[PDB]
Structure 1
Amino acid sequence: SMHLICQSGDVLSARYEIVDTLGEGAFGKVVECIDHKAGGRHVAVKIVKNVDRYCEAARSEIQVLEHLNTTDPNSTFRCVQMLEWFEHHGHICIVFELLGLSTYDFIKENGFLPFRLDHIRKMAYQICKSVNFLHSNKLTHTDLKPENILFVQSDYTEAYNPKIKRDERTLINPDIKVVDFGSATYDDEHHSTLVSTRHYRAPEVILALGWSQPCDVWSIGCILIEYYLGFTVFPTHDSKEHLAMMERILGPLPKHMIQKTRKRKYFHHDRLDWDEHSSAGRYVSRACKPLKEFMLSQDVEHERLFDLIQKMLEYDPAKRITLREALKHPFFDLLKKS
């Protein structure tokens, strides 16, 4: 039914002409449109599947963006601006400023290669500033991932970089914004037991110990390592394998978190019940590595990045670095006068 109303040429709300699809999910899709009542300006419209789960998420997102766009009308803190919302043939549609590619599509279309370190630095700072602003307003985003970070403009120059032997796309401007506030939760709201997309899920979430702001910090840690590597660090759908991956990369989970989890399935007597010599086990041993072994250079800037990531990927949420502390980290010094 959604395909009936989201095609090129369609006009929504007697105003917005659909050009093309920007992205799709189980929530619905986002299409680029020409706004004929605003001079031809292109915008992005999110058309939400007509399903209670996703409908409530959209009403929720509207609430949250009205708050944030009011607090921060100039978008100093880099949340996407919502321009309008409306109903179209029973579907909630939310209009946003049009942005560039997500950091995920860019990596994908560039052959799954990493970003340059100086871009990672600017991007990381903006992500941390943005989400920290959410945290100031008693909000957790809960679904941070590279699909939900978008370049403001994804214009690029090309050069034959013979370090790979292939034409290369290089970002002109690495500014980003954060999108997708339909899972965002206030400190006082009910916290659902399963949040975040699998690969960016914090261990307190997987183990169902409760969560709040710190789980975003774990997500940002994952995002940063993917920017550095150009691939997903926890490419698994299974929770136990995910936990095994964490151990191979970050070492054993804290005894005290294991004792507390309602998810007894995953464990035996204080250790993860994981057979290293199994098929999946041997894959994890050879693929996954201790964090620091992923570094591509001993150069101090690389070390600095990896120190920050390590602190974002602290298992115990109570000990995990906060974004307020993260913004003062030495990795970011190169962005400041002195």
Structure 2
Amino acid sequence: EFHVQYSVGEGLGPTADFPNGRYQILAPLGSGTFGKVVSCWDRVTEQLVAVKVIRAVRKYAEAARMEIDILLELGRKDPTSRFHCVRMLSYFTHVSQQGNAHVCLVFEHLGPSLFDVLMRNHFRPLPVPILRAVARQLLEAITFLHEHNQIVHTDIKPENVLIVPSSYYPNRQITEHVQVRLIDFGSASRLDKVSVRHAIVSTRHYRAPEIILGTGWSFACDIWSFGALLVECYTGQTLFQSHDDLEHLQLMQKLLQHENGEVIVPPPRPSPSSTSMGSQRRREALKLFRDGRLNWPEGIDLARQKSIRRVARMPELHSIFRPEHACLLHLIRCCLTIDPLKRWRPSELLRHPFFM
């Protein structure tokens, strides 16, 4: 099956009073492989809402109900979104005009994303006072997930941070009074019973090294993504621009090579007698190492010359930050540690001097 197909003006989720649809589609809000997101007029309450229509596939439908399961809990504990996660108002199944069945989630009216904010400013650096406000509210959301709910997000990234329209201005620039919302809990997970997983999670640019290495990931995988997000706001640019595992790990090595410790260490050799998902990942990760060292640049093999220049342009972490922003460098250093066991809890990072 495929995605939903809509024209502006048609209605979603028909009911007895509105057989054409309770939610009148107003404008597109965003989309992706998961489905589509439309701004809608709730004909019942006569309020602005956002409806996320999920592509009629059980890969995405199962993720969607996982997101419903999480947002139901977050909404009950934190109804006014004190902890800045997106508020889900409703959920229903929309039987397509064409035949497919679509789960849809109803949300508070959504503003543009943090990625949208960056792109529209030509990926110019985000001012530190505004970066601080975004980081604090984001860290409050992550604290709410990890410690108040034992949930790991696994996909912290600028696209998954939305600006509340009230904080947004018609001149399309955010101040330090901006309010954010952490969104997209379909790839989230509950670690209350099984706290260590080995599935490949997170989008590539924000993926923590332990996910690539197969040593087992947990809540700390979100802190690394947070730290890469912060750097991205400070420079305007995506930190790790690579899709190859070996080169990606070397970019980590190059960036953190002057933070002492901080070296890419291979995972323990797995059982040859194990068809586990952990062993398979560690089996593939150990091919990127020769004798306990990351096999870069010899492991790329032409291309070894392109990887050498790309890694050479990768800046060292200290070099990125201006002298008057040493405190923000210190905060990020407790985030971008290669060993996940040295990363701080989000509650500890909220007490970091950068936030006072």
SS at match of 1:84: strand
Moved more, 116-125 or 246-255: 246-255
Q: Tell whether the 8 Å contact from 2:266 to 2:294 is kept in structure 1 after alignment.
A: no
TM-score, with structure 2 as normaliser: 0.85
Question: Which residue matches 1:225?
Answer: 231
CA contact (8 A) 1:244 1:284 kept: no
Greater Cα shift, 253-262 or 5-14: 253-262
Partner residue of 1:142? Answer: 154
- Give the match's secondary structure for 1:278: helix
Deviation at 1:233, TM superposition (A): 0.4
2:158 is the alignment partner of 1:152:
no
Structure 1 length-normalised TM: 0.89
CA distance, structure 1, for counterparts of residue 64 and residue 11 of structure 2: 21
Conserved in 2, the CA contact under 8 Å of 1:311 and 1:320? yes
- Give the direction of change, closer, same or farther, for the CA distance of 1:67–1:4 in structure 2 (3 Å limit): closer
Task: Give the letter aligned to residue 265 of structure 1.
Answer: K
Show the counterpart of 1:288.
314
2:43 to 30, 36, 44: 36
1:177 has 2:178 as partner: no
Look up the equivalent residue of 1:26 and give its one-letter code: T
Give the one of 125, 129, 133 matched to 1:114: 125
Partner of 1:265: 287
When residues 53 and 4 of structure 1 are mapped into structure 2, their CA distance, relative to the original with a 3 A threshold, is: closer
In structure 2, what residue type is equivalent to 1:268? R
Residue 199 of structure 1 aligns to a residue whose secondary structure is helix
Query: What is residue 23 of structure 1 aligned with on the other side?
Result: 30
Number of residue pairs matched by the alignment:
319
- After superposition, the Cα gap between the structure-2 partners of 1:120 and 1:275, relative to the gap in structure 1 and judged at 3 Å, is same
In structure 1, what is the equivalent of residue 279 of structure 2? none
> In the alignment, what sits opposite 1:83?
89
CA contact (8 A) 1:9 1:18 kept: yes
CA contact (8 A) 1:23 1:29 kept: yes
Give yes or no for contact 1:104–1:147 (8 Å, CA) kept in 2.
yes
> Do the aligned partners of 2:198 and 2:217 also contact (CA within 8 Å) in 1?
no
- Deviation (angstroms), 1:191: 3.6
Change (3 A) 1:4 1:134: closer
In structure 2, runs of 5+ residues without a counterpart are: 14-20, 96-100, 270-281
3-state SS of 2:238 partner: coil
Matches within 5 A, 1:1-338: 5-13=5-13, 14-39=21-46, 41-89=47-95, 90-136=101-147, 137-153=149-165, 155-156=168-169, 170-172=173-175, 173-187=177-191, 188-189=193-194, 191=197, 193-251=199-257, 254=263, 256-259=265-268, 261-262=282-283, 263-275=285-297, 278-295=304-321, 297-299=322-324, 302-333=325-356
SS in 2 for 1:292: helix
- Within 2, Cα distance between the matches of 1:3 and 1:268? 45
**Counterpart amino acid of 2:164?**
V
- 2:84 and 2:182 in contact (8 A); partners too: yes
Alpha-carbon separation, structure 1, partners of 2:151 and 2:306: 37
CA contact (8 A) 1:15 1:37 kept: yes
Which deviates further from its counterpart, 267-276 or 315-324? 267-276
Asked if 1 retains the 8 angstrom alpha-carbon contact of 2:214 and 2:267, the reply is no
| Partner Cα separation in structure 1 for residue 229 and residue 340 of structure 2 | 17
How big is the shift at 1:98?
1.0
Cα offset, 1:6, TM superposition: 2.9
Q: Deviations over 1:207-241 (max 9, x none)?
A: 11111111100010000000101110011122111
Partner of 1:162 in structure 2?
Answer: none
> How far off is 1:4 after superposition?
5.2
Residues 250 and 291, structure 1, Cα contact 8 Å, conserved in 2: yes
Which consecutive residues of structure 1, in runs of 5 or more, have no partner in the other structure? 159-168, 334-338
CA distance in 1, matches of 2:226, 2:197: 20
- Distance of aligned partners of 1:19 and 1:103 in 2 relative to their CA distance in 1, 3 Å threshold: same
